[model samples]
Target: SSDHLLKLSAKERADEATEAFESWYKSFSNGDVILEINKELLKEGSGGTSPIELQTKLIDNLKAKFGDKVSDDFYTSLQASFNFNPVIVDGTKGLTISKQNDDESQWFSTWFLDTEKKEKNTKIIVRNDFPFEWVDWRNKGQHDEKVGKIFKNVDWDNDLSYEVIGIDFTEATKNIETNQILFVQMHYNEKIGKWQVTGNVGGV
Candidate 1:
């Protein structure tokens, strides 16, 4: 039965996607289901393609299916999802932010500090499902794929180069004090326009 279902046509697949979404919706309270579905759809469409028609149709179908059961907040939340802030990095030539880098990968750095303490600290890294026009979780496998290996070879005391592909300030600095500062840097090869970082969140 599973094998037979896997061979379903495009229309059948779309129908299945709709049914699965609806069934999942029925399991939750009003508005909660829409929020959950919206998160999943956001992940699915993180690669920059617009899912407007499908999202609109799905919302309409859910509203119609549930009639008065759907909450007024459902549409409002759905519309709010489209209002996310765009990711834009300022890359003025040679302009620096203390110890921060100016490359595109600099967008991934989570924190910056101007202290002289040399102790090694741990940090966390978070990444958008889609990064840039041609990169994402599926294509890159994971955020660590871009910078994990390079972090293994960093010398903390020496000024190093890196391209910050991801950052996680909350997770990395959960126990840190206000006096201490976290600095994250990324290395960029100006010749090829490629980027990589020198350390993972937990690494020094």
Candidate 2:
């Protein structure tokens, strides 16, 4: 009962949202649930969504239940989430290092070199969640609906543009095969200010 959910300031509302939302995530004992969210309101990180936001959206958007979470073996199938880093290492020569993009993580798929090292050009893909947010499987379904899930992780809900991170062209296949999610197609016409997730996760 010791929750700071609403007792904190507006600046801390996001953190409060995380707590309140995750508390609800623990309710979903099933892995076969996919939530069709607005992609923006999700950024709310608040409790105003009402328990009913689940229906029309789970509650309405999801319309109905889908499937489950990827098994431990499924993690091996996450080829898209896997990538390598190429950093130069030569302290004496001062050759220096660089990358495919700034911060080395270009396009969210690969992270290259930086200017702080010195060595020959090289590369190798390591196995890790990398730059993307990993609840460590503790709350993978936090983005779903009424069945119960977490809605305030890493998305923006505002009057400006909306952007989504952690999307890779490779992992979509395995996810769809295992009853995860398949984003068939998607697009947003700014004139209307409405973004949609109709394009299943991958092109499945």
Candidate 3:
């Protein structure tokens, strides 16, 4: 009710959808789903009262095949990136949802939509200013714990430096503009670990 399909532009919507799918996929395809998967998506996918139901069935199969290892936030993240279209699948009017590349507007929508979609709650707001698609820094050795050049201010020996050096990847951003360098700025929380996306705006 709050946001119609017209609320955001196609590109903005695309990024939001991509972000949600990536997080969901990071958790899903990686077999970290948070729900019980006692069902399959194809044969078990029928007579769902709502989109959640179908989404549930789809995930159920995923668990069965992959075993438990899915992200707890998988479902929420999936729903958050709700950009789907209807198509004929299995001789029924089902919905399709898939991940898309940034250069591409849409990607694989293999699944069909066959469930109740009541209020249209399949969208998330993607910040226009935050456009970088980040990946892991991948090499801890680069930081060189001996000298600790990454965080020049870090005092690894002193117990007090623990808090001060917490997750500081300051050196990684030195050459981010030309793709010469990459670093993951993240915060460790109760959820084990998470990505950190600080403001990109210069006015900050």
Per-prediction TM-score to the true structure, in the order listed: 0.19, 0.20, 0.25
lDDT of 2 at 23: 35
Q: Clashes in each model (backbone N, CA, C under 3 Å)?
A: 8, 29, 12
- Residue 103's C-alpha lDDT in candidate 3? 18
Best by TM-score: 3
**C-alpha lDDT values of all predictions:** 0.30, 0.26, 0.29
lDDT score at residue 2, model 2, on the 0-100 scale: 24
Give candidate 2's whole-model lDDT: 0.26
Model 3 poorest 10 in a row by lDDT: 195-204
lDDT of 1 by residue, 9-82 (tens): 53453344334333433444422222112222223225322435434544565466444332344344433332
Candidate 1: give the clashing pairs.
123-201, 151-198, 162-186, 162-187, 163-186, 163-187, 163-196, 164-186
Among these predicted structures, which one has the highest lDDT?
A: 1
In model 2, the Cα lDDT at residue 93 comes to 24
Select the stronger candidate by TM-score from 1 and 2: 2
Off by over 4 Å in 3: 1-50, 83-95, 98-204
Give the per-residue lDDT digits (tens) of candidate 2, residues 62-168. 22221121122222222222222222222232222223233221222212112211232111112222123212112333343431122232243331121222223
Q: Worst 10-residue stretch by lDDT in candidate 1?
A: 87-96
Query: Model 1, residue 200: displacement in angstroms?
Result: 36
Candidate 3 per-residue C-alpha lDDT over 105-181 given as tens digits, one digit per residue, 9 for 90 to 100: 12111211112221222211111112244321223322545423433333334311011111222333211111222
Stretches off by above 4 angstroms in model 1 are 1-49, 85-204
